[PDB]
């Protein structure tokens, strides 16, 4: 662990190919020792003790380095001992692929401890992901095996920490927030049916933050699926008119193999294919409609009862009462007058939300040009109502 978690011409693969080794050390085990003369349990327990040891001694704390960030994760996103930090990271993914499974009976006694000190560290090391990720691993292992049929000490621990992290999460940005959300939406929660009004913002932020980060969409989908299929079908109902309407935006060359295929097919395509897991968004939409029909038509109508218009009308109204920004595009002899307003909304939202670097750059250049245009135009037309629309986007940009 200490080494293969420390590895960050000569080529150095870091940890991603130690993984199958360790999986066969414990899981693919009866198929390799049968030629010899159990070890699965001992090695799993040793791996968990060792990872607990490393978490105990890594000094994962952070220090501020030379404004005033309100973001608690800030320039402070800089550990004191970066080699330790990278070691913890290699640790978190290594455990993540070593511990989705092999829990058939092995993780049964480790849940309470593993949790308890992950909560303890993550409470004094709050803004350090991977703690959350190990928590989500251990809670999903506590979910595969049942472990939550009512021990009760860890139940109260998870309840209190779920509440605390769900309230602290409303500050966290991309990687931290993603780890927190995957944690929260991995509680069994067919066992915590209670206070479901505090776990809904963590599912609509894991839906809204989807559409770009597919595994967050996947965790949101499994969350909603479990909440539908196992929670009681009278309290899950009032919390459909605000959990489906955030799920609507989802519903919107010459290689070696090619040369081998061109030159007949004699053992060359075989070797070329023999030489050669992010979820696909299309399958995400497929599952959205699948469970959208699987949840009925009684429940279903809430997908589009958001308000039928709440703030997209702010994008569907005239930014100004009467048009300004008359721009005479100069041809040879005629010079006709176009209006920049009409496409100012689409440009100003292409600048912010583009998901396309070339389109983003073009849109930002247009907002620059149009901003200068509109500050010029009033210099020689009362026009502040479009400043009121366009400064809240200059500051965002």
């Amino acid at each position: 662990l200490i080494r293969i978690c420390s590895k960050p011409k000569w080529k150095v693969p870091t940890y991603k190919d130690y993984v199958d080794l360790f999986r066969h050390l414990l899981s693919s085990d009866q198929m390799m020792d049968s030629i010899l003369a159990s070890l699965n349990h001992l090695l799993y327990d040793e791996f968990v003790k060792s990872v607990l040891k490393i978490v105990e001694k890594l000094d994962l704390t952070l220090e501020i380095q030379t404004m005033i960030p309100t973001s608690d994760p800030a320039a402070n996103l800089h550990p004191a001992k970066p080699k330790d930090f990278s070691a913890f990271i290699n640790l978190v993914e290594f455990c993540r692929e070593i511990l989705p499974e092999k829990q058939a009976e092995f993780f049964e006694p480790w849940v309470y401890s593993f949790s308890y000190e992950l909560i303890l560290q993550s409470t004094r090391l709050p803004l350090i992901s991977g703690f959350y990720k190990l928590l989500s691993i251990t809670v999903r292992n506590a979910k595969k095996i049942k472990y939550f049929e009512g021990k009760y000490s860890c139940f109260a621990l998870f309840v209190k920490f779920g509440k605390e992290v769900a309230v602290k999460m409303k500050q966290y940005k991309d990687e931290l927030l993603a780890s927190c959300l995957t944690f929260l939406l991995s509680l069994p929660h067919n066992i915590i049916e209670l206070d479901v009004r505090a776990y809904v913002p963590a599912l609509q932020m894991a839906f809204k933050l989807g559409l770009s980060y597919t595994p967050l969409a996947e965790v949101g989908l499994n969350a909603l699926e479990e909440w539908s299929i196992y929670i009681d079908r009278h309290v899950m109902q009032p919390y459909y008119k605000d959990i489906l309407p955030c799920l609507d935006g989802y519903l919107k060359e010459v290689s070696a193999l090619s040369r081998a295929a061109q030159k007949g097919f004699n053992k060359v395509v075989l070797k070329h294919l023999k030489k050669t897991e992010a979820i696909s968004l299309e399958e995400i939409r497929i599952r959205v409609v699948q469970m959208l029909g699987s949840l009925g038509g009684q429940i279903n109508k809430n997908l589009l009862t958001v308000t039928s218009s709440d703030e997209m009308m702010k994008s569907y109204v005239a930014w100004d009462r009467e048009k300004r920004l008359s721009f005479a595009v100069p041809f040879r002899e005629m010079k006709p007058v176009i209006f920049l307003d009409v496409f100012l909304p689409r440009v100003t939202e292409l600048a912010l939300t583009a998901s396309d670097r070339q389109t983003k750059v073009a849109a930002c250049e247009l907002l620059h040009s149009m901003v200068m245009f509109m500050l010029g135009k009033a210099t020689q037309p009362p026009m502040y109502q479009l400043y009121k629309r366009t400064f809240p986007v200059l500051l965002r940009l």
Binding site: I2, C5, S6, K49, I54, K57, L58, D59, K81, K83, D84, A87, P109, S113
Partner: protein, 630 residues
């Protein structure tokens, strides 16, 4: 409560012995509970560790704990230790109680050394790596327990004696390496620890011809702790190292195929010697290592030796630097009847590296020591009636020329030009006579070399050729650091006179060796340290290899940046390349030299086409010709 000290007036001992009955019963429970009457978990271990922490929080109980560690009872299981298991199970709270009170835990532990040697070694080693682990804020118990387990070394004595189990000798070597690594550099003087009785152990484990080579390779890592000794003890240690070398080392060279079960042992022992020597900048380690190195045509590990010497010289502590320099120097300068080849090897591949990589930024020390001891031998006159002494004088003169070359190539100009102290000791003592006195004396005696004719000389021809080459290299180095502004490079290094058979290039070039010329050519790296602790240019083909091509090319490029043709280097080499009556090899050499210095001969193109062209085009070149040279 124990943090508040109210552990006894809230839980007492009865009208019994001064020991705490509660602690005794708790510790007995923890000892015989994990024993069968079994099963184990992590929470149980957390309890039991807290339980025995409580047990030790009462009072002393330490001698009882130790007696439990050495208790030789046997627990059967298909029957391993029954007393070690209690240790390895906890192994951390145990050892932080033993390090709670020193001088008694260690004493009571080592007292039964001959009885439970496995157990006493295990517990002492655990105490050691426990204390090494906590040195960041507590590098105090480490020193105390190291010194304390040294103060009783005469008790743990049967371990290193002769005909012991040849597993406890290396066990005590590992323990002893641990001890020395913990404490400071203290165990050598005025019997700080047990000076006599601990050296006797090192000398004995590195002495007797019943141990192995890897065992002493482990042993020769104590050396960086023990090379700072002095006359008696250091002389004895150097003696025993020398019998090690004579008794287990290959006699002059490899003579071992790579893979036989001597070559691997030899390379292991040698590299351990070498990295020890790179740790402790110890002169006599250089004596031994150069001695073995410069004793064959070319050692197998030459590059290792050279990198080691590069580190050695590059250390600081200039007095130690000068000591290494003077040590290898005196190893060469001495009148020992050594072979000429070996003696000249001493300077070639041992002390030139040390001189190149560190002497001093404005050095005086070594050169000032050797000025009027090497000048006088350069002025010495040969006696061509005996092969041996003549050869040795040639080799020593060559070496002195090479050393002067190194200083003049490295030492800045001023502290050899100006009215100095580094210089003023060839003539009239350190008085202010004229300045630049040894510049001109060395110039005379060097130019008089490599220009002395060889008509009547038919005894040692290759050696004298190398003598001339080294002299000429020394000359080139000094002239690059003479005033060197006007036509100085011409009178010497060039412009000889064949009236009385002065031939620079004819004599240093071989002229009878037929060149072949083939056609073409941190808090987690710390836990690395605790596991460490508790475990143990050009194409140098056939005529760039002439010991004058690289110096001559550097000199030519230097003259390019220093001021038809130019008087006697453009023109004298021009006229020695032109006519095909000059012997072939000089002409090949000058072609090589002009090739490597092409950038110099770009303004002089119109002069420099005829002789190169006729050298390529002529038919004089042997074999199928100088084809890659063409």
């Amino acid at each position: 409560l124990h943090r508040a000290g109210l552990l006894h007036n809230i839980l007492p001992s009865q009208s019994t012995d001064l020991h705490h009955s509660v602690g005794t019963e708790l510790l007995s429970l923890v000892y015989k509970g994990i024993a069968p009457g079994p099963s184990l978990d992590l929470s149980c271990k957390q309890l039991a560790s807290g339980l025995l922490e409580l047990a030790f929080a009462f009072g002393g109980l330490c001698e009882r704990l130790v007696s439990l560690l050495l208790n030789p009872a046997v627990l059967s299981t298909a029957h391993f230790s029954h007393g070690e298991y209690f240790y390895s199970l906890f192994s951390e709270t145990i050892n932080t109680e033993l390090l709670k009170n020193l001088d008694l835990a260690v004493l009571e532990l080592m007292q039964s050394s001959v009885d439970n040697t496995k157990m006493v070694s295990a517990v002492l080693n655990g105490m050691l790596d426990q204390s090494f682990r906590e040195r960041a804020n507590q590098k105090h118990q480490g020193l105390k327990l190291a010194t304390t387990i040294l103060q009783h070394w005469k008790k743990c004595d049967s371990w290193w004696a002769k005909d012991s189990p040849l597993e406890t000798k290396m066990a005590v070597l590992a323990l002893l390496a641990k001890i020395l690594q913990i404490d400071s550099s203290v165990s050598f003087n005025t019997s700080h620890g047990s000076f006599p009785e601990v050296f006797t152990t090192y000398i004995s484990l590195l002495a007797d011809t019943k141990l192995d080579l890897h065992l002493k390779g482990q042993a020769v890592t104590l050396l960086p702790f023990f090379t700072s000794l002095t006359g008696g003890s250091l002389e004895e240690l150097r003696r025993v190292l020398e019998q090690l070398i004579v008794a287990h080392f290959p006699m002059q060279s490899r003579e071992f195929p790579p893979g036989t079960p001597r070559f691997n042992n030899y390379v292991d022992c040698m590299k351990k010697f070498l990295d020890a020597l790179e740790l402790s900048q110890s002169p006599m380690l250089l004596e031994l290592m150069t001695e073995v190195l410069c004793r064959e045509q070319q050692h197998v590990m030459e590059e290792l030796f050279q990198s080691s010497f590069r580190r050695i010289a590059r250390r600081g502590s200039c007095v130690t630097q000068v000591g290494l320099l003077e040590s290898v120097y005196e190893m060469f300068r001495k009148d020992d009847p050594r072979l000429s080849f070996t003696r000249q090897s001493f300077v070639d591949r041992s002390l030139l590296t040390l001189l190149w990589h560190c002497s001093l930024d404005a050095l005086r020390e070594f050169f000032s020591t050797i000025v009027v001891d090497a000048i006088d031998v350069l002025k010495s006159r040969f006696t061509k009636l005996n092969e041996s002494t003549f050869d040795t004088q040639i080799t020593k003169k060559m070496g002195y020329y090479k050393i002067l070359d190194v200083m003049y190539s490295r030492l800045p100009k001023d502290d050899v030009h100006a009215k100095e102290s580094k210089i003023n000791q060839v003539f009239h003592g350190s008085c202010i006579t004229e300045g630049n006195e040894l510049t001109k004396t060395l110039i005379k005696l060097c130019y008089d070399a490599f220009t002395e004719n060889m008509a009547g000389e038919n005894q040692l021809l290759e050696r004298r050729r190398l003598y001339h080459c080294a002299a000429y290299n020394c000359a080139i180095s000094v002239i690059c650091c003479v005033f060197n502004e006007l036509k100085f490079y011409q009178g010497f290094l060039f412009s000889e006179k064949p009236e009385k058979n002065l031939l620079i290039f004819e004599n240093l070039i071989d002229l009878k060796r037929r060149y072949n010329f083939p056609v073409e050519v941190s808090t987690l790296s710390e836990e690395m340290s605790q596991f460490d602790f508790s475990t143990g240019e050009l194409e140098m083909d056939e005529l760039n290899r002439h010991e004058c091509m690289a110096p001559l090319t550097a000199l030519v490029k230097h003259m390019h940046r220093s001021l038809r043709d130019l008087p006697s280097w453009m023109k004298f080499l021009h006229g020695k390349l032109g006519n095909p009556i000059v012997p072939l090899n000089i002409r090949l050499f000058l072609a090589k030299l002009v090739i490597n210095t092409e950038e110099v001969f770009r303004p002089y193109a119109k002069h420099w086409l005829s002789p190169l062209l006729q050298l390529a085009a002529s038919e004089n070149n042997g074999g199928e010709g100088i084809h890659y040279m063409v």
